[PDB]
């Protein structure tokens, strides 16, 4: 299975960079395509971390993918899996498997954050995601 | 007095950036050093706000600071104070002649449990003298403000006006308690870093539980 992700909004959040990086490291650059990027986009609009991993991306929609990437299997009516709750990397991780819900992460200094998604468990996160979650977690506090 | 904070963790959380920024604005960039940063740290890892404020940092421990920052006075044995919650002697105004540096030991995880105070003292048994700052936990910026009041202004701990565990109410159904002792300003309000109350308010609007 190959994966297509529509990324239309401008710029790449750190969250998304970590997610796409994990996906690339798990299925490989030949199995992921970003489609429908803003017309503005050139190759320095793309994060260096993603470029280093060989990210396939285009401004064309998913039907223009075979136009831009001649080494890919044609998109046929009715092989590919498209992203128009799980995180995107979790969703892809499970699909790979086939072919814990609302986990609470507890950190140092009495901090904790629960994440509003289902995850795969020996929870699997993109590399660096735990640090990013920690980064937005507020100092030890009590809700009254 | 100069301040050393062991920052022995990857990353800078937003609340930590606000606290460090407040410390830098208060004591100055020449008087704060972050030490024992993860070995992989480069300037690119330091928040832009802190770089612009002149933050000094090193991956070396506190005994490597003088080598990295040649303008600083030497760390001298017995003249470096370690904040120590297990100590009984509070920092007093008379300690101002005794200490040149005040150290916040790193806070590490529970895997495995570590006693950073004992690690530091075992590494450098001639170096550190323990002091307490009262019997209630403070945020780092509050601890530094408190130390300034005691050492610079010569105000004894028992004469500083504090509030313990202030509660910040954002509406009739939501309030947040910060489980720390804070210094009061002259209007009777706890002194928080710029932006911190906003951050607390932002968290209040987000998903949370009360049990
Ligand atoms: Ni309570
Ligand atoms: Ni609430
Ligand atoms: Ni909260
Ligand atoms: Ni919940």
Domains of chain B by residue range: 2-155, 164-205
How many contacts (CB atoms, under 8 Å) link A and B? Answer: 52
Interface test with A, best of B8, B9, B13, B206 (most A CBs within 10 A): B13
Q: How remote is the CA of residue A143 from the centroid of ligand 1, in Å? A: 7
Distance from C-alpha of A104 to C-alpha of A116, rounded to nearest angstrom? 9
Closest residue to B176, CB basis, from A135, A136, A143:
A143
Q: Token pair for residue A48?
A: 């260096």
Q: What are the angstrom distances between the C-alpha of A126 and each of A90, A113, A135, B69, B88?
A: 9, 16, 15, 37, 45
Task: Give me the residue label for tokens 């969703």.
Answer: A91
User: With contact defined as beta carbons under 8 Å apart, do B95 and B48 qualify?
Assistant: no
Provide CB contacts within 8 A for A107, sequence distance 6+: A113, A134, A137
Is the CB of B11 less than 8 angstroms away from the CB of A135?
yes
Task: Give me the residue label for tokens 């950036």.
Answer: B17
In a 13 Å sphere around the CA of B173, the CA atoms on its Cβ side amount to 3
Structure resolution in Å?
1.9
Q: Token pair for residue B207?
A: 């998903």
Give the closest residue to B148 by CA, choosing from B135, B160, B165, B158.
B160
Output b/e per residue, B121-160; b: 16+ Cβ within 10 A.
beeeeebbbbbebbeeebbbbbbbbbbbbbbeeeeebeeb
Q: Quick count: other Cβ atoms within 10 Å of Cβ A72?
A: 16
**Experiment type:** X-ray
Q: What are the angstrom distances between the C-alpha of B189 and each of A122, B16, B152, B166, B167?
A: 48, 21, 22, 9, 11
A43 vs chain B: nearest CA distance in angstroms?
A: 22
A80 vs chain B: nearest CA distance in angstroms?
A: 35
**The CATH number of domain B2-155, selected from 3.40.50, 3.10.450, 3.30.450, 3.40.1280:** 3.40.1280
User: With contact defined as beta carbons under 8 Å apart, do A89 and A119 qualify?
Assistant: no
Q: How remote is the CA of residue B170 from the centroid of ligand 3, in Å? A: 13
CATH class of A2-98: alpha beta
Task: Give me the residue label for tokens 């890919």.
Answer: A72
Q: Quick count: other Cβ atoms within 10 Å of Cβ B25?
A: 13
How would you classify residue B181: left for phi > 0, otherwise alpha for psi between -120 and 50, otherwise beta? beta
């Amino acid at each position: 299975m190959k994966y297509i992700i529509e990324h239309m909004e401008e710029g790449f959040s750190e969250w998304v960079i970590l997610e796409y990086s994990q996906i690339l490291r798990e299925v490989g650059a030949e199995n992921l395509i970003l489609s429908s990027l803003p017309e503005s986009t050139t190759e320095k609009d793309i994060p260096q971390r993603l470029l280093k991993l060989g990210l396939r991306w285009t401004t064309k929609d998913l039907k223009g993918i075979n136009e831009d990437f001649k080494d890919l299997e044609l998109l046929k009516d009715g092989d590919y899996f498209v992203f128009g709750q799980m995180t995107t990397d979790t969703a892809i991780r499970t699909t790979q498997l086939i072919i814990i819900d609302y986990p609470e992460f507890r950190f140092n200094k009495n901090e904790a954050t629960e994440m509003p998604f289902r995850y795969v468990l020996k929870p699997i996160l993109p590399e660096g995601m735990l640090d990013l979650i920690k980064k937005d977690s507020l100092e030890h506090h009590h809700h009254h």
